Symmetry: C4
Subunit: 388 residues, 4 copies
Amino acid sequence: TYMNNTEAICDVKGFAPFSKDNGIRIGSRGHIFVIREPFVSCSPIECRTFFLTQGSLLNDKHSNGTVKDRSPFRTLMSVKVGQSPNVYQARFEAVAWSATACHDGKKWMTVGVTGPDSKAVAVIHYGGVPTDVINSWAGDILRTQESSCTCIQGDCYWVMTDGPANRQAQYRIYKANQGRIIGQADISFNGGHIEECSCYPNDGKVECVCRDNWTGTNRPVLVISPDLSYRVGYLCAGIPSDTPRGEDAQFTGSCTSPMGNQGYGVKGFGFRQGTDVWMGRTISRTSRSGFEILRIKNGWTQTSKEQVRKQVVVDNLNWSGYSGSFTLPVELSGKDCLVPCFWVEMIRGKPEEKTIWTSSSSIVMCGVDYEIADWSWHDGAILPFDID
Amino acid sequence: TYMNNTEAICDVKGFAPFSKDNGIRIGSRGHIFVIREPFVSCSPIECRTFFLTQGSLLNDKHSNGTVKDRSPFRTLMSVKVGQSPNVYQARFEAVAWSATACHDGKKWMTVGVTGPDSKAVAVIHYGGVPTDVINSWAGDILRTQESSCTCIQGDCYWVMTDGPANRQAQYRIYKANQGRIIGQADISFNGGHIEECSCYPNDGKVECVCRDNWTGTNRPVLVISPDLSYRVGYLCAGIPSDTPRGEDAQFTGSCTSPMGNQGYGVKGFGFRQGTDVWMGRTISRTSRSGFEILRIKNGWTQTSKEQVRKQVVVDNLNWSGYSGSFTLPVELSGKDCLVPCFWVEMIRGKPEEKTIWTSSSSIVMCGVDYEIADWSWHDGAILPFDID
Amino acid sequence: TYMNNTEAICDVKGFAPFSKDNGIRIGSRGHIFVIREPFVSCSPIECRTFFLTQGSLLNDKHSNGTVKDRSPFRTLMSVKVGQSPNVYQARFEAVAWSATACHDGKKWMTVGVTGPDSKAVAVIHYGGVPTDVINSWAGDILRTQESSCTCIQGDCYWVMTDGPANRQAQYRIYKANQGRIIGQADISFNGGHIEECSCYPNDGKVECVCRDNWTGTNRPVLVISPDLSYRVGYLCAGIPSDTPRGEDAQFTGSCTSPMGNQGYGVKGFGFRQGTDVWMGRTISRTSRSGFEILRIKNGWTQTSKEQVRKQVVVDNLNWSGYSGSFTLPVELSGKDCLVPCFWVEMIRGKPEEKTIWTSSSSIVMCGVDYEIADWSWHDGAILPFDID
Amino acid sequence: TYMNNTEAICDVKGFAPFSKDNGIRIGSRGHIFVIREPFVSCSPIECRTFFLTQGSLLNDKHSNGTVKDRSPFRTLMSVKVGQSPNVYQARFEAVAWSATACHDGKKWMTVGVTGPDSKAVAVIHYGGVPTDVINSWAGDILRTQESSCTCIQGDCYWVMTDGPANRQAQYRIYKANQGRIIGQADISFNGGHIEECSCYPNDGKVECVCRDNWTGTNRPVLVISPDLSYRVGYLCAGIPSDTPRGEDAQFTGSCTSPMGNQGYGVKGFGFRQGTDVWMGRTISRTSRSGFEILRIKNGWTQTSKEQVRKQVVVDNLNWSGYSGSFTLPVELSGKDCLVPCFWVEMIRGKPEEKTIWTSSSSIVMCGVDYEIADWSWHDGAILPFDID
Ligand SMILES: CCC(CC)O[C@@H]1CC(C(=O)O)=C[C@H](n2cc(CCCO)nn2)[C@H]1NC(C)=O
Ligand SMILES: CCC(CC)O[C@@H]1CC(C(=O)O)=C[C@H](n2cc(CCCO)nn2)[C@H]1NC(C)=O
Ligand SMILES: CCC(CC)O[C@@H]1CC(C(=O)O)=C[C@H](n2cc(CCCO)nn2)[C@H]1NC(C)=O
Ligand SMILES: CCC(CC)O[C@@H]1CC(C(=O)O)=C[C@H](n2cc(CCCO)nn2)[C@H]1NC(C)=O
Ligand SMILES: [Ca+2]
Ligand SMILES: [Ca+2]
Ligand SMILES: [Ca+2]
Ligand SMILES: [Ca+2]
């Protein structure tokens, strides 16, 4: 039977640890993939950790230059959540240097975007096997979520991006059924910039918090019905949640325009909670260090700065990076609502550390009905390694 | 269908080897987790070995300082009983530096206690996924069994501890249904001290033999009905089974007060056999070396010192440590009673041995209807390793 | 139920990446088999990568002299497609230094040809276990496809070769039911030479594109009905697709005779598309470097040189080698036709590279309904390794 | 449903390769157990390779002194047939320095004999979990088959030995149901010596070819009905099949007395074929080198030396050792008879080779309806290793 994602998001007060794989501590000795862009998505029965291997292993010469973004050695693979991307537990999913994946109830669907920058191709897999394709429509680095896609009653939805990195690109939504694409929509976002959308089910529609790599230090927001009529804009909250951003007092919020004049960005997430919003952001406003998630009273619908709850997952002396969203299916949590959950990627090595390589580990969190104490579940690996 | 644990414990005469993983011999070369606190628990169809990784691997720099108790790299994982905690066979269970886990018939439930000492959080998993939480109630190192919890007809029960290590702490019982907590009880044990309870089903109620880290060299006993009305005290037996303890002749037994004035303690187990009790204790009365289990005529209900049976599992020139309890479900043994079984952890390295690390291996035993010869199935690994 | 392969081949316009295992990059450090002759074949539910281990591992002394073709250490094993032939994921299939394997709907059948050259023996497995045998009939290196066999409604068909390497050998077809051989046919190909046939289902019959190691620089073609009455000849196309071959202008095509007077050859594939043919060939006309696949208007039935479509999978500065065919069962693709798919093997080391060993990696491709951009998904491993 | 082994043994003409694991070639680099006594046994759906680890790994210091026979680090584990005993694929079966295992149709039963020599204990497992026990009855190295036991319609039968190694010991038969022992029989063999019985189903009864470590250079034979009334003696064949033995001409055969006055022995097998017998023996009459199997016309019932068929599996310049029996269940081969199959162990290292360790690999064979060419599928590993 097709899996339900009609339900409302559980209003949550705090987040509790789901997992931590220790891939890089472990990788010092064990056989673990050099990766980046880890993410999570769940089936009726398990939660899995997708990721992009650099086609090589930690502590090996082949991990040299693994800070590069797009190589033909790049693949998408998966493991049981909390397990490290070690060679002997990773399932093959797709060739990809940009990806997304989710479950419709019956099988896994995955999108693998590889190829030359001018002409990338996204290969849709369903049941492990290629089913459909989208070729680059704008000829400049076709790319997508790097976090779980979404499936609401058998049909799956996700967001991609083609175009320049620091100017107006173009944003499309896609809809498929059993690995087969059955619809699409071009997003009208003049003067806006949408990348790496962290989405989730909610009230029967798809809500994504995405990244502005142009000017905004606030995050684009895209709310998608199944008929593909969307509504697009930014996270109302008067608090900047990109990185880099400016200070909180020094920020004016907007549900409509992008705000701040800092370039660049980082992947991040938000969860609408009725009217409030849980937002994640690296602690450091400049560097990809630390992590913390804030509940803001009415920060989704209104430009509020009212932080009702704060919690720290990675402290500021520790590295982090990307973070994103996914939900536990009702068939997994037994809850009458879709538990909000997230994960943080924790990058180590180059460019900041004295290694020939770049990789990352993760900690997954999940929404419980109480406040959880602050702590720092960091990567915790000693650098350099021996290959360095 | 929900699994039965109504049954009576098989009166057993001796214990026969269930398994031995050789993790540290194997770990010299293979990829095995640095761990401690191994334990066992069974499903309708398999027996599994839970454990706490130090988020690192044997023979690796990251195994340095792995004598520490609570790090954020700490996780709970599982394998098939007798298999070593190697990377590629370990399933992820929870983030934990203190834990317990069991099966209700339908899925696995696990409790993962991590966080800062002042404010620990216990994350209940069921079916791999977080379902409920308990925050530290006394602000000092929330902790639990480090041995299998217990599930009697679909509802699961276990014992935790918050408070100081060597004075009056506070002890709670918890009850849950499918990862969801549905009841609790505060244990009244003034002048008593309950830790690391080794429990099991018996006559339809939960019986635990726990650790006194305060003064007692005998072990607390807690007998728990499903309505959460308990009865608490010590193991009547006139023989001390903690470590360190004093000699046997130099010991007065009590079902009520703690006895001996030695501090400290170690995790251990007991099995009520009608009126008698099987008790495990490290051979050495001072050091964590050797192991042996004694049947005492009427040592559960009365303060007897009558050893009807003795058996040695690890000899005194060999290291050991923690030991605990679990049962084979009727759906596994075919017996009309719940076979008593136990395991012994065998610690090696720091603090006693010339290594940068600390870890342990295990041998599981099980109740058969005959006396079994003495022997010593020790860890048997050659120290130091190369990383040392 | 027995699996269908009655259907027609999907007319495809371009091919999109199915997988890439990175075995040799990975093998630098991880535990991967030294292999050659990888290939693919699918079940109702998964696609698997068969291969021939050299009974040893990459970066190990035992990988010395692994350029040899036939050793008693040679075995056939399998993994999930896209996974590398690593020790801990490889299933055992058969002892073989030449092989083929496929699925009939119920279980896997595999043929393992090992033994001395003068008297080889092919062991048919079905369900993992030996079921039937064929002894060498001509006493000179009994051998077969090194690419998936074919199963059409419960009965499986494949092609073997006994005899000299560079003169008239002898070619047989075999037919079996559940690992049991129920028919055979001697192919009459005087002055022709058939080896390493790359086959697939199509319209209810078996079509193979094979290798001419005698004189032809075009490829033998064998079309096989289930009654074992075949029709044999060469690929009409006026373009040479063996290696080595001569130039395209300097080639006269023939559906009947072999063409070119270059000896040797390499394994390769073709897909009939109604009247046109997709053909693969290494880019370099002399060396086993690069790869590319061309659709030729009416090149199957007529001696045409009309290339309607071109696509490059491995560029000419990169190594490749063998390539072959297989299809995705309708029960896997949901398509009303059997998606054509192929894979390319990418050899590295000896004889061309400064290593003591020889091995290879793979990229699998699959037929989609659009043109896919050119690129080069090469092996990408840095040579020599440390063992060298 | 309980599995059938009523059937007759397929009269076979030759044996064809089932598998070869290459454990020691592979072990040079990969993580493989140091072992001995490998053996095979099949379930309705798979064939598995049991073995005795030395609780350590190849190329590791802990493999020192692994020529010893009985250590407490010794365990029994299993893998899919043809797979090597690598850490990450081995299932745990039992603690054992002597063993046997088989399948009754529903679950696996295994016997694990460990402990001190004077008082060994055999732990019966069924479904992975300990179910029954037999204590040493004669106080001198309780031991058993080291090759598959036998299960005929739900009840399982096997043979053990207690007593001295080179004089009269004592031999018992055991019968169990679902890991539970329901019968036993003392074998009357005055002046005879039965060890390491290689058994199999045949006509509804159990037939074993065992080892005489006393005086016989011919092999004891024990034919066992399910009521436990046996008939015991030696293999009639006038050809010696132990090792060491004397020449063939210099041998008088006896179905009754032991023959030859050479001490010692090695494990080996025989298959009754109507009246004839397939017998295996190492080629060298003195050393454990080479292997070959001979069909002898009427060598089971009469003292014949008529070799109708010969076949060589390992040549005489290559090491071998133990060999034993098992059958493919009808539910696996589809044959109306139980295909005879065997395996040969191939020992390497100490005492004969320049290594600190001793271990072995295997090749499994199986009965097909034709003669198979001679060859030598030897271990093929280069010695010493690096640890040496
Ligand atoms: C800075 C450019 C950014 C916005 C378009 O792209 C992502 C930026 C990035 C980041 O860390 O900021 C990650 C994405 N990425 C990284 C990689 C490999 C990282 C290896 O260390 N592959 N994709 C990049 N995406 C792709 C498709 O290349
Ligand atoms: C000595 C303190 C004792 C009583 C409260 O605690 C356990 C004592 C201990 C022992 O060996 O005596 C083990 C428990 N522990 C150890 C570890 C890591 C051990 C790594 O070598 N994590 N928890 C300790 N528990 C926790 C939650 O830290
Ligand atoms: C050049 C001879 C060719 C035509 C008969 O045989 C294949 C040629 C070959 C190739 O690369 O051209 C591969 C086949 N082969 C290779 C190997 C091992 C390769 C180890 O590097 N086993 N079989 C060879 N087949 C066998 C059964 O030995
Ligand atoms: C020479 C004594 C023989 C007859 C009683 O015993 C077997 C002889 C032997 C052999 O190779 O001849 C193998 C059996 N064995 C070996 C081992 C470990 C071998 C490690 O290299 N464990 N049991 C031995 N059995 C046991 C229970 O120790
Ligand atoms: Ca930005
Ligand atoms: Ca104490
Ligand atoms: Ca040719
Ligand atoms: Ca003998």
